Design a protein around this ligand. Structure first.
Ligand SMILES: Nc1ncnc2c1ncn2[C@@H]1O[C@H](COP(=O)(O)OP(=O)(O)O)[C@@H](O)[C@H]1O
Ligand SMILES: Nc1ncnc2c1ncn2[C@@H]1O[C@H](COP(=O)(O)OP(=O)(O)O)[C@@H](O)[C@H]1O
Ligand SMILES: Nc1ncnc2c1ncn2[C@@H]1O[C@H](COP(=O)(O)OP(=O)(O)O)[C@@H](O)[C@H]1O
Ligand SMILES: [Mg+2]
Ligand SMILES: [Mg+2]
Ligand SMILES: [Mg+2]
Ligand SMILES: [Mg+2]
Lengths: 535, 385, 106, 49, 307, 523
């Protein structure tokens, strides 16, 4: 200790490597119990009694307060997987931790970490190639039931699992509704434009898909109407309030006779703007800013529906969906103030609907584009939030399936096939990198193992049967259809998951593998740790 | 060494030594510290033998001069046209770092970048501030990219206008907002008509500004960052968007020289001087999204691509991204060393071993008390292998 | 009990306990206010925490000035306050009749 | 009115740290729950496996 | 020179007030009895705007003291300089009122305002020309929230042409200090923005930090008094709605921070409707909370107009 | 210390967590188990504000108690959900959820997987919904007697049961008056436009719903009339005072006459506002903001009665009641914005306070329920019961379907589920039949709280419900005997019972899905 004068603690060698592996294992054991259709949810209490129910690994690792850096790495890994894919946040963490475990076992056996890293990189590349070449199914060959099956697969393990038969229909309809093609003629599916509202009350099956848009807002005055049929919609990015001269402008009166006209002008300016807006036929006025009572009275007398403090993103979406133009100002290229009816949007109805004890606004059947909103209905806010997270996962998955038209089977099929193929492929690459690739292959088996364990089944026997099927598939060209075999966790028996409908987007597995490999490599590269004492 | 807060004076001095090596060569910051520690560990036994520190120092200077001779004799000349030699130098520099499975990707990039920011016939050095590195989370290190144009983290202010082809770009160091003299200014209203007049004249001022901008053919507008005054008022943004002009504000006063060097623009500080000759022509300007991991403005293609390049560093973790950046910097500094001194030496401890050997010979030839010190220098240099 | 397994620092009076508590507090109030009733009643002196003196024979004043922290006493004080706000008289008799109803029911 | 007082009688006469449980809920069900917890502590040791 | 009446409500208010009325009394020579044991004539130059001299040269202060619970005014009587005050300017109820804004602002302590108003009249009558009032209270907390806004209200109805300079103890960000503070403070700001003319936001957190810096509960009432005298011992409020201030040594827009915090904790609790039954079952409609919230987003946007 | 998670992060997992959640839930249930039925007893709750809450309402109790177990938190949240959605069943739902979790504990101890139990529960929920919709009956909402019986069948279990006829008539009148349609959108907002004002004292038998509204207000000036027999009313959001401008309107005076001229200009502004108001020839003016004394002078000169500072909600109710439209600029005032429809404005002294009545309206789309009684606590309980009654009336007017009460519906559904389970051959038949038998807790609880023999009565009832046309048979909560609901009259709203069953089953599903609690971590 004495020679090196650093003011901190120092771990070195097998000590710090084992410590890093312990941290990663801890993080993975936190989430292992929440993997697959037989995984279960977790409570999380935020030191104040704030409760969160969830199965989302990214959510869990965000809510946790982690202290070890090698575990913060896996937390960021789950976050990154959620950002780039939207599903696989638990599998990626489990796989990264298992890769770390086996790689540290090799380093203890004194295979050099560089060699382990080379072998892991090779196995990652070859696993990606083998997936893309042998394990993908075309969603064109499969149709729309492929999308429904992918959504149901994503919803299994969530609190909208068994209700998947109907939630998958909702998700698919919503993504197809928000489908839009842009310049370059490429089809784009911009999820996060589907609005998701939560409202405890009626059962899950009573959740609603709104052909149009749902706004978590209400009218500004109770004297205003709360339903309009041929809605002409005006989206404004400025406030409708009593006009005050700006900061660099002062009123200095030296003739009292001007005070009255100045004071009345301060309101007549906004009055004139509102009259100009209403003259075009606008019966619905959405605003990101505020609306004084003086203005709300104008809307009431006109029979219009005004909404204030609307959110910028909600406004952008309503505008795109209805055909309107968001105006930050009523100002044209002629130095005047006008409002054209072409800047208006349209909708077959705008209503304020009564959701159990609250109220919101529904914009139904907008033209110039179709939009989609979803009102989730559960037993309390905990249920509703978990439903929101599950539905976001499902929407991201369907988006990926529609963007890249390839899917892979689930239930550990891909992991079993990769284990077989890579344990056969390792024989060609070096002698120690061979061991590293074999360990990568064996690590990949942690997914079906965990699925079976959670299903309370003989993981050893089940994964052995799986590997037997996939080895038969890879050694007998007449039975290559066995690739599609995976776990049926409701019966503890392998099953053709391509015919059962257990599909996952290829991007899920590919990105999971790449990110897990990078995380394992970065953590495995560490052979020392200097922890400085805080000040 | 800079990150571990060493406390002993000698350790601090070794930190400074490693920083000096990072400055002068950018590669070898570990070898230099190891060599220093070993030379001192040899001074241990020399002092014990009873040699004076001054004699040790002078004999070390002698051994240093002889070792410079030896290394120069070992060296072989190199032409910057030898792209394979440059690639091999970069791969050697990267072999030690976490980015070595991606060396196949980051060595050609590290050679292209440096070879793009220097005139290879006259250059005697390179300023690596001409090479911009942009760390963006997400993806993997195999997603690192060499952008020949310009990359900016600033967001686009227009909604709907993200892509521009045949882009004419202008830098605006003045503010598109209500006029404000450098002196204390007020606008005293005393009649109701003056209120409407004030609003109208403000609108007209802003509209005249944006019209003088549009008249040049400018469709991409980079606005410098302005404290003490609004550089882009809501009126100005409205008018620019209606005129179909992409707008990027909050450009930093330190990125201006870089952006100009990159896309041939000339910074304009008065609307009167904003003309077509002060613009930069780029074949494309796009706001690209990185798989929900952020956004980047890429100005690619340039009619005046003047000796500047950018490297986008991707990665799955903040830690691995930072180490990728550091390693790429090491590769660029290796290429910089090759540019400075057109000489190449083998690796794998060959120079250190040759040093040990030839300085052992030198010590046997320099009979005296300097012989012990030179032999110590040799056995100390034998520590890197 | 049930509430104490969820909120450990919870106070609970059940079935018979609750009735005993309520009837005891009501009879205590009645015992204090019995002497206010009628012209032959006795005047009570009430001293604030500052030392201010109140001489009263009024049931509502006596209630609000007494130093009591009981839930049943609060309930009956509120009933007396409503009686006083609407009619101006009858607070002592109100308290007495409540206490005696509770006693005769016990 | 922010404190429930001990009821007159046994609840007040009870000693400081003493506890009194009565009825199916406070006594019978808690006893059954305790015995069940005990059986659970020893259940996993029953039999050859 | 016109006279200023000084009301002080709630524990926080009643304990800032006494310290202020002590600092200034010593700044004027008045002892606890009220006798002017002073020599300089500048102490008597502007003494009529704060003290109401009586026969016998006893300068009684122009101060009212209010709280629904007598035990604070008892501690004020018993405290130091607790005898200059008029023995009739102490107006108190018997109900504690907890920390419910509805309890303090409604029938659960509403008649009392009609006992503090016949003391405001009996204190203005003495004033030759009444400049206005200075109410010291707490934005959210105990009665100061409810009773401190039903007072600004009824005094702006009874004297609607006078300066109302409030000193309110805005809640500290780190310390919640109460479970219903977000509600009380948005409901009180919703009244002070309208019925007030200038408000000085005295943050307990910042005051505590300043006290710690000086060191290098009473200490806060002793570090708020020197600021209250540096404000009331001798060009502001350009716009008649941004009349909130942060004292020091400031009409800063840092107020916008405090308001964002308060409105985000208000919205957090309002979403789940937590601690709302008390207000609705004691005299509020569920829409007064939406109005309060709207008006605080208003304020935050008026303050966001600059930067 | 080299930890991976921060100290204070404690993680429990497994059957201990499951049993803990289930015990917490059934404890929450046992708290309010006795508050169900007509023969329930009151509970005296002590608020943190020194207050008291004497109630029988499950949601009131669970809202006033505080817990730390997250399962108990979830149960309290579902009680709140039921109350906000339908406004009744707040303890039936709690009891059903507790019983469902209790019966699921069995299958969980026996190695069944929670997902299997949950799928079975969802099947059973769908079939419960089907059976309820099959056994439901329609209602002619025009039958005031039928509606009064529904409201009696809903308030009989509460303290106001002694004044059942009164409370039923009050609730029915209030909801039928708040029923409002505009632009083809029917809306019964009994939260903004049916107001309950509790004035302690008097007697409950004089409580009434007014054909108008009531506020706690007096005239601004005692020369103003307090009695007007056909008042034309104007409502304003703006102050009739002279307030400052939004800008820095600073003035600069150098001439002598200018100061006085400015003050006279202020007075003339107030005069002009009051003239813009008088031009409509109103009788009453009601403002949400102040009214200056000069404005009062001018209005009185015009023989107008003014009310100074009313709440925005009260002003909206006055609008709905008297047919007016709130304005914010008296220059923008129109005859259509003036309020005709009120039949009498009265300002009378109730106790020592002045209350303004705008009653005798014709077609008032808003109302004020004036409750009178012994104390604030009694009146709070009466108000809660009336909220229940009005929410039930609203639920009926929305969905006119009825189902039988007294546990008759629970037994009918349990029988239907047991009959449907015989076709099931998998392993979920057992949890399915278990929730079926877990529905029996409602009649069980009714029998327990009336004081009869649960074993005997529930056996006789399960036997009665095995016959063909006996799905209407239930139990009396007052005598402990089986009766036909067609003969007793206890009929619940199908919407209420649907929401009850759905919330219960989904709460059970949620708490079963839950495992592996984690805690400590700080936001
Ligand atoms: N119906 C199913 N049968 C078998 N396996 C499934 C099924 N649905 C999902 N899986 C498996 O569950 C794994 C992921 O489960 P989950 O934890 O819910 O998703 P994530 O990995 O996004 O957290 C996938 O690898 C998939 O193979
Ligand atoms: N592939 C290789 N084979 C053998 N030696 C190598 C290889 N790559 C690098 N080296 C040696 O490693 C040393 C560089 O190690 P490095 O970690 O970069 O230390 P420094 O930072 O001091 O340069 C050089 O002396 C070089 O000779
Ligand atoms: N007189 C009665 N006899 C028998 N059962 C009744 C009677 N009145 C109501 N019930 C039943 O009691 C159940 C619950 O009553 P109530 O206490 O009002 O609801 P909750 O238990 O949700 O508070 C209802 O489902 C109803 O069928
Ligand atoms: Mg998933
Ligand atoms: Mg190197
Ligand atoms: Mg009497
Ligand atoms: Mg009921």
């Amino acid at each position: 200790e004495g020679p090196l004068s650093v003011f901190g603690d120092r771990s070195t060698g097998e000590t710090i490597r084992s410590q890093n592996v312990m941290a990663a294992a801890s993080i993975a054991n936190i989430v292992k119990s929440s993997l697959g259709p037989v995984g279960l949810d977790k409570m999380l209490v935020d030191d104040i009694g704030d409760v969160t129910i969830t199965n989302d690994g990214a959510t869990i690792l965000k809510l946790l307060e982690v202290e070890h850096p090698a575990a913060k790495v896996l937390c960021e890994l789950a976050d990154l997987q959620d950002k780039e894919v939207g599903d696989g946040t638990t599998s990626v963490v489990i796989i990264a931790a298992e890769l770390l475990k086996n790689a540290d076992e090799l380093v203890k056996q004194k295979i050099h970490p560089t060699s382990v890293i080379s072998g892991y990189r090779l196995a990652c590349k070859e696993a990606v190639r083998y997936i893309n070449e042998n394990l993908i199914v075309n969603t064109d060959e499969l149709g729309r039931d492929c999308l429904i099956n992918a959504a149901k697969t994503s919803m299994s393990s969530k609190i909208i699992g068994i209700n998947g038969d109907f939630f998958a229909n909702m998700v698919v309809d919503a993504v197809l509704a928000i489908k839009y093609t842009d310049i370059r003629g490429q089809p784009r599916y911009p999820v996060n434009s589907v609005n998701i509202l939560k409202a405890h009350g009626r059962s899950q099956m009573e959740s609603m898909l709104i052909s149009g848009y749902a706004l978590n807002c209400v009218v500004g005055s109770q004297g205003m109407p709360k339903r309009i049929v041929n809605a002409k919609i005006a989206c404004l990015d400025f406030s409708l309030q009593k006009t005050k001269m700006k900061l660099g402008v002062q009123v200095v009166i030296t003739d009292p006779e001007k005070l009255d006209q100045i004071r009345q002008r301060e309101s007549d300016i906004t009055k004139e703007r509102i009259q100009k807006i209403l003259a075009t036929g606008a019966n619905v006025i959405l605003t990101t800013g505020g609306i004084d009572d003086m203005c709300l009275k104008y809307f009431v007398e006109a029979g219009a529906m005004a909404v204030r403090r609307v959110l910028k993103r909600d406004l952008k979406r309503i505008a795109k969906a209805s055909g309107a133009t968001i105006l930050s100002t009523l100002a044209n290229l002629e130095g005047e103030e006008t409002f054209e009816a072409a800047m208006l949007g349209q909708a077959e109805e705008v209503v304020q609907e009564r959701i159990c004890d609250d109220e919101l606004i529904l914009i139904k059947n907008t033209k110039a584009r179709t939009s989609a909103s979803i009102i989730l209905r559960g037993a309390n806010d905990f249920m509703c939030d978990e439903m929101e997270r599950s539905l976001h996962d499902a929407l991201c998955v369907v988006k990926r399936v529609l963007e890249s038209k390839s899917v892979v089977p689930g239930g550990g099929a891909v992991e079993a096939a990769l284990s077989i193929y890579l344990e056969n492929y390792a024989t060609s690459m070096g002698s120690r990198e061979q061991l590293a690739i074999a360990e990568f292959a064996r690590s990949l088996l942690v997914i079906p193992n965990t699925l079976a364990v959670n299903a309370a089944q003989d993981s050893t026997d089940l994964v052995a049967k799986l590997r037997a099927f996939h080895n038969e598939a890879q050694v007998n060209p007449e039975r290559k259809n066995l690739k599609w075999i995976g776990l049926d966790l409701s019966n503890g028996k392998p099953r053709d998951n391509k015919q059962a409908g257990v599909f996952e987007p290829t991007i899920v597995k590919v990105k999971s593998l790449k990110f897990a490999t990078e995380a394992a490599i970065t953590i495995l590269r560490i052979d020392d740790l200097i922890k400085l004492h805080p000040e | 060494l800079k990150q571990m807060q060493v406390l002993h004076p000698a350790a601090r001095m070794l930190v400074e030594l490693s920083k000096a090596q990072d400055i002068e060569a950018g590669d070898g910051t570990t070898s230099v510290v190891i060599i220093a520690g070993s030379l001192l560990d040899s001074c241990t036994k020399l002092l014990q033998k009873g040699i004076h520190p001054t004699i040790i120092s002078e004999s070390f200077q002698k051994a240093l001069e002889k070792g410079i001779e030896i290394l120069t004799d070992m060296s072989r000349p190199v032409e910057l046209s030898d792209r394979e030699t440059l690639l091999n130098s970069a791969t050697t520099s990267l072999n030690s770092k976490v980015v070595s499975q991606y060396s196949s990707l980051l060595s050609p990039m590290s050679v292209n970048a440096v070879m793009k920011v220097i005139d290879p016939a006259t250059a005697t050095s390179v300023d690596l501030r001409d090479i911009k590195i942009v760390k963006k989370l997400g993806g993997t290190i195999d997603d690192c990219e060499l952008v020949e144009g310009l990359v900016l983290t600033q967001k686009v202010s227009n909604s709907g206008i993200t892509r521009v082809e045949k882009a004419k770009i202008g830098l605006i160091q003045f503010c598109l907002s209500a006029p404000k003299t450098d002196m204390d200014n007020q606008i005293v209203v005393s009649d109701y008509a003056q209120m409407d007049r004030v609003l109208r004249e403000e609108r007209a001022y802003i509209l005249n500004l944006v019209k003088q901008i549009k008249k040049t053919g400018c469709n991409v507008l980079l606005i410098q960052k302005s404290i003490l005054r609004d550089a882009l008022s809501d009126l100005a943004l409205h008018f620019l968007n209606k005129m179909k002009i992409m707008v990027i504000k909050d450009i930093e006063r330190e990125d201006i020289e870089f952006i100009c060097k990159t896309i041939g623009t000339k910074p304009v500080a008065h609307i009167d001087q904003f003309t077509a000759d002060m613009l930069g022509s780029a074949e494309l300007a796009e706001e690209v999204n990185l798989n929900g991991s952020g956004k980047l403005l890429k100005i690619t293609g340039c009619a005046s691509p003047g000796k500047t390049v950018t490297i986008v560093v991707r990665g799955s973790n903040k830690l691995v991204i930072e180490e990728a950046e550091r390693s790429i910097h090491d590769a660029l500094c290796v290429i910089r060393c090759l540019v400075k001194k057109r000489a190449l030496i083998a690796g794998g401890g060959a120079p250190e071993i040759e040093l040990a050997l030839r300085l052992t010979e030198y010590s046997r030839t320099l009979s005296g008390m300097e012989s012990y010190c030179v032999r110590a220098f040799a056995d100390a240099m034998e520590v890197i292998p | 009990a049930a509430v104490k397994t969820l909120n450990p620092k919870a106070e609970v009076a059940r079935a018979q306990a609750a009735l005993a508590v309520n009837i005891s507090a009501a009879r205590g109030l009645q015992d204090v206010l019995r002497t206010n009733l009628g012209p032959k009643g006795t005047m009570k002196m009430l001293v604030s925490g500052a030392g201010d003196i109140k001489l009263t024979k009024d049931g509502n004043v006596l209630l609000h000035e007494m130093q009591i922290q009981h839930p049943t006493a609060s309930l009956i004080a509120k009933v007396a306050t409503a009686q006083d706000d609407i009619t101006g008289d009858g607070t002592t008799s109100n308290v007495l009749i409540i206490g005696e109803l509770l006693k005769q029911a016990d | 009115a922010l404190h429930v007082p001990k009821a007159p009688g046994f609840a007040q006469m009870l000693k400081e740290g003493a506890k009194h449980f009565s009825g199916l809920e406070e006594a019978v069900y808690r006893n059954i729950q305790a015995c069940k917890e005990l059986a659970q502590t020893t259940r996993t040791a029953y039999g050859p496996n | 020179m016109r006279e200023i009446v000084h009301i002080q409500a709630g524990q926080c208010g009643n304990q800032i007030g006494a310290k202020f009325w002590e600092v200034i009394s010593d700044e004027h020579g008045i002892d606890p009895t009220g006798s002017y044991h002073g020599d300089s004539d500048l102490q008597l130059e502007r003494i009529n705007v704060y003290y109401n001299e009586a026969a016998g040269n006893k300068y009684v202060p122009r101060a009212i003291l209010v709280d629904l619970e007598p035990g604070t005014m008892d501690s004020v009587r018993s405290g130091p300089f607790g005898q200059i005050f008029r023995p009739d300017n102490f107006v108190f109820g018997q109900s504690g009122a907890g920390n419910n804004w509805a309890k303090g602002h409604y029938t659960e302590g509403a008649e009392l305002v009609d006992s503090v108003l016949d003391v405001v009249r009996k204190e203005s009558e003495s004033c030759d020309c009444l400049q206005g009032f200075q109410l010291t209270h707490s934005l959210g907390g105990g009665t100061g929230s409810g009773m401190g806004t039903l007072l600004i209200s009824k005094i702006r109805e009874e004297y609607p042409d006078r300066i109302m300079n409030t000193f309110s103890v805005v809640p500290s960000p780190k310390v919640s200090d109460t479970v219903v503070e977000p509600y009380n403070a948005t409901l009180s700001v919703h009244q002070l923005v309208e019925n007030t003319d200038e408000t000085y936001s005295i943050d307990n957190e910042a005051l505590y930090d300043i006290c710690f810096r000086t060191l290098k509960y009473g200490d806060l009432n002793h570090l708020v008094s020197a600021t209250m005298s540096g404000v009331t011992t001798c060009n502001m409020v350009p716009f008649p709605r941004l009349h909130f201030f942060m004292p020091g040594f400031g009409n800063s827009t840092a107020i916008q921070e405090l308001f964002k915090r308060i409105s985000e904790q208000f919205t957090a609790m309002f979403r789940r409707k937590a601690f709302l039954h008390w207000y609705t079952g004691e005299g509020m409609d569920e829409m007064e909370f939406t109005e309060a919230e709207s008006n605080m987003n208003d304020l935050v946007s008026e303050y966001q107009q600059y930067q | 210390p080299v930890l991976v998670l921060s100290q204070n992060t404690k993680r429990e997992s497994g059957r201990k967590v499951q049993s803990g959640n289930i015990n917490a839930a059934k404890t929450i249930a046992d708290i309010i188990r006795t508050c169900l039925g007509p023969k329930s007893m009151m509970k005296m709750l002590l608020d943190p504000m020194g207050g008291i809450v004497m109630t029988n309402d499950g949601n009131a109790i669970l809202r006033e108690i505080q817990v730390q177990h997250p399962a108990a938190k979830s149960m309290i949240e579902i009680s709140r959900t039921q109350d906000e959605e339908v406004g009744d069943g707040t303890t039936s739902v709690i009891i059903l959820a507790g019983e469902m979790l209790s019966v699921a504990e069995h299958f969980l101890e026996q190695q069944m997987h929670p997902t299997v139990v949950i799928s079975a529960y969802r099947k059973a929920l769908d079939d419960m919904i089907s059976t309820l919709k099959k056994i439901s009956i329609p209602v002619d909402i025009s039958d005031s007697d039928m509606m009064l019986n529904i409201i009696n069948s809903s308030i009989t279990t509460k303290a106001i049961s002694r004044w059942s006829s009164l409370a039923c008539n009050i609730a029915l009148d209030a909801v039928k008056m708040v029923q409002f349609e505009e632009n083809g959108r029917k809306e019964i907002d009994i939260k903004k436009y049916a107001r309950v004002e509790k004035i302690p004292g008097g007697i409950i038998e004089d409580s009434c719903v007014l054909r108008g509204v009531m506020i706690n207000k007096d005239v601004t000036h005692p020369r103003m009339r307090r009695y007007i027999k056909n008042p034309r009313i104007v409502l304003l959001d703006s102050s009739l005072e002279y307030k400052k401008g939004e800008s820095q309107t600073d003035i600069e005076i150098t001439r002598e006459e200018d100061f006085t001229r400015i003050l006279q200009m202020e007075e003339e502004y107030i005069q002009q506002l009051c003239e813009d108001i008088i031009q409509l020839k109103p009788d009453v003016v009601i403002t949400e903001k102040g009214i200056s004394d000069l404005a009062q002078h001018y209005l009185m000169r015009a023989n107008i009665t003014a009310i100074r500072r009313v709440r925005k909600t009260d002003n909206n109710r006055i609008a709905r009641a008297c047919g007016a439209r709130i304005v914010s600029r008296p220059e923008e005032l129109r005859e259509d914005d003036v309020g005709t429809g009120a039949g009498l404005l009265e300002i009378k002294k109730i106790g020592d306070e002045y209350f303004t009545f705008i009653t005798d309206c014709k077609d008032p789309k808003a109302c004020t329920i004036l409750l009178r009684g012994a104390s604030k606590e009694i009146l709070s309980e009466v108000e809660r019961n009336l909220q229940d009654a009005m929410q039930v009336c609203r639920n009926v007017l929305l969905d006119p379907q009825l189902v039988p009460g007294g546990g008759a519906s629970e037994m009918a559904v349990a029988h239907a589920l047991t009959e449907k389970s015989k076709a099931m051959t998998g392993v979920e038949q057992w949890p399915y039949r278990a929730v079926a038998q877990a529905l029996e807790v409602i009649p069980r609880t009714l029998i327990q709280n009336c004081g009869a023999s649960t074993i005997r009565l529930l056996t006789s009832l399960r036997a009665k419900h095995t016959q063909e046309n006996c799905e209407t048979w239930g139990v009396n909560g007052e005598t402990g005997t089986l009766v036909d609901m067609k003969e007793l009259g206890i009929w619940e709203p199908l919407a209420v019972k649907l929401q009850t069953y759905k919330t219960a089953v989904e709460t059970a599903v949620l708490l079963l899905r839950i495992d592996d609690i984690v805690s400590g971590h700080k936001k």
